[PDB]
Amino acid sequence: HRHTCKVMVLKEEAAGSERALALDMREGQRVFHSLIVHFENDIPVQIEDRFVNAQVAPDYLKQDFTLQTPYAYLSQVAPLTEGEHVVEAILAEADECKLLQIDAGEPCLLIRRRTWSGRQPVTAARLIHPGSRHRLEGRFTK
Amino acid sequence: RHTCKVMVLKEEAAGSERALALDMREGQRVFHSLIVHFENDIPVQIEDRFVNAQVAPDYLKQDFTLQTPYAYLSQVAPLTEGEHVVEAILAEADECKLLQIDAGEPCLLIRRRTWSGRQPVTAARLIHPGSRHRLEGRFTK
Amino acid sequence: RHTCKVMVLKEEAAGSERALALDMREGQRVFHSLIVHFENDIPVQIEDRFVNAQVAPDYLKQDFTLQTPYAYLSQVAPLTEGEHVVEAILAEADECKLLQIDAGEPCLLIRRRTWSGRQPVTAARLIHPGSRHRLEGRFTK
Amino acid sequence: HRHTCKVMVLKEEAAGSERALALDMREGQRVFHSLIVHFENDIPVQIEDRFVNAQVAPDYLKQDFTLQTPYAYLSQVAPLTEGEHVVEAILAEADECKLLQIDAGEPCLLIRRRTWSGRQPVTAARLIHPGSRHRLEGRFTK
Structure with missing residues (x-):
């Protein structure tokens, strides 16, 4: 386990119709968008495709996300009080498959x-993992 | 309308994989149930489950169309800890047939x-077509 | 020894609070059970439960000293999602009486x-004298 | 939504019986101890009384926890893999009521x-919250 990453995208853009729904925003408002690929022993294991309300975290594009995760950084900038996750088994988009070095038919674990x-x-954020390279694991009392 | 079909309910030798899971020898008896769950006549889950026969000796007596195997086991022994592993997989050919899904359909596997x-x-191995189930959680920090 | 007593088991109108809890009209009918659970003679929990009467038409016919409301409801409908809210509260006068606590004793509420x-x-509202119950667990991160 | 905090205690001390059992150590071994009052918009919401194994986080005492919470810091120092919780409703002690600015009879949510x-x-950690000011919420598929 040699963990490595590459920040592929870090920019401002309009929320648009999808981030408007996702972040309860107007389509015209600005968001920041980072896309990071994570590698284990040089093999892609996760895409983290993240959008942030730009008014909440004005300095987000100034960060080096090879040195702190976007989540960690956000947690210092704003008090994060609640979270949601949705886990699905999907086929990834064409360009996501290319970034992950998987064939298009390879099932992936998505955590939104x-x-x-x-x-x-x-x-x-959408965390997309090749299904052959990552599993969610845990143990809990009852 | 939720409905289910008990496809298998029987006693079987544990075999290698179940013996390992339950710290048993391979010839030791397990009970095995395979249940398919349906929403509005559409398959949404296969539950393929095994239990140590010595722990729930009346398991085969139950009508698991009336209550789930899990809720049944809850009542025979105090269930105190659970482990899970979630993966995105393609199902086996026979699973695709029971679930009425494309061979290529991504599925959530929960073991x-x-x-x-x-x-x-x-x-248990729980298999859900990807188009038909998701795990959702929302929680204060 | 765990014992319990079913204190209320009746049909009523949802009214304004159950209209909000269950997304129902105020005049829609609900079933209401209130059960007190004891440990060795000493109250440890009130389970005050409301149920949509169309979902579980036979709820009033059950003997809930023999099976819990939640376990019964599990058999009548696929229960697919649950919400929990844990607060530290002071209980209503009548609840303090049922639990044999003073009005100022803090209680653990799980709604x-x-x-x-x-x-x-x-x-449902589960109300536990803070001195007689704790919620405990452990889980991987 | 704004989180601020006041560090009341930051010191090395003996584990004692409690922390010896909590942290699997000798009662005489040194542990680090912080007590911080957390505010949400200037109103007290939590007293966090936290103890830390000095060997795992040797530089704990050196930190400015007005800039970061102890948990965030600690999760940087070591991978945190498992958590245990005990939740109770109690009345706070008189000194804790003064720190939280609450009525003596306010029911408090205690999380250990x-x-x-x-x-x-x-x-x-022993975290005490005014019951009117914090609760635990979750919703989850079964």
Whole structure:
């Protein structure tokens, strides 16, 4: 386990119709968008495709996300009070498959995450993992 | 309308994989149930489950169209700890047929094992078509 | 020894609070059970439960000293999603009386709601004298 | 939504009986101890009384926890893999009522937590919240 990453995208853009729904925003408002690929022993194991309300985290594009995760950084900037996850088994988009070095037919674990600071949505990410390279594991008392 | 069909309910030798899961020898008896769940006549889950026969000796007496195997086991032994592993997989050919899905349909696999104190009691492989189920959670920090 | 006593088991109108809890009209009918659970003669929990009466038409016919409301409801509808809210509260005068606590003793409230698909099935308030109950668990991160 | 905090205690001390059992150590071994009052919009919401294995986080005492929470810091120092919780409703002690700015008869939510990194206990905390000011919420598919 030699963990390595590459920040593929880090930019401002309009929320548009999808981040408007995801972050309770108007389509015209600005978001910041980072896309990071994570590698284990040089093999892609996760895409983290993250959008952040730009007013909440004005300095987000100034960060080096090879040195702190976008989540860790956000947690210092705003008090994150609530989170949501949705886990699905999907086929990934063409360009996501290319980034992950998988064939298009390879099932992937998707975890969609949203995080709130008080009642306000802060960030929405899609974590996409090749299904042959990552599993969620845990143990819990009853 | 939720409905289910009990496809298998029988006693079987544990074999290698179940013996390992439940710390048993391979010739030791397990009970095995395979149940398909339906929403509005559409398959949404296969539950393929095994239990140590010594722990729930009346398991084969139950009508699992009336109550789930898990809720049944809850009542025969105190279930105190569970482990799970979630993966995105393609299902086996026979699973695709029971679930009425495309061979290429991505599926959520949930493998579970549940314990009564330090004894593993039951283990299950739960397979859901990707288009038909998701796990959702929302929680304060 | 665990014992319990079913204190209320009746049909009533949802009214304004169950209208909000269960997304129902105020005049829609619900079933209401209130059960007190004891440990060695000493009250440890009130389960005050409301159920959509169309979902579980036979709820009033059950003997809940023999099976819990939640276990019964599990058999009548697929219960697919649950919500839990844990608060530290002071209990209402009548609840303090049932629990044999002073009005100022803090209580652990767990407020639960369970759905079957998109449909809210039941909402319950579990109230525990803070001195007699704790919630405990452990889980991997 | 704004989180601020006041560090009341930051010191090395003997584990004692409690922390010896919580953190699997000798009662005479040194542990680090922080007591911080957390505010949400200037109103007290939590007293976090936290103890930390000095061997795992040797530089704990050196931190400015007005800039970061102890948990965030600790999760940087070591991978936190497992958490244990005990939740109770209690009345706070008189000094705790003064710190939280609450009525003596206010029901408080008490959470006692331990966190492991692998099989080593890293930290144990006693968190007391005014019951009117915090609760635990979750919704989850079954």
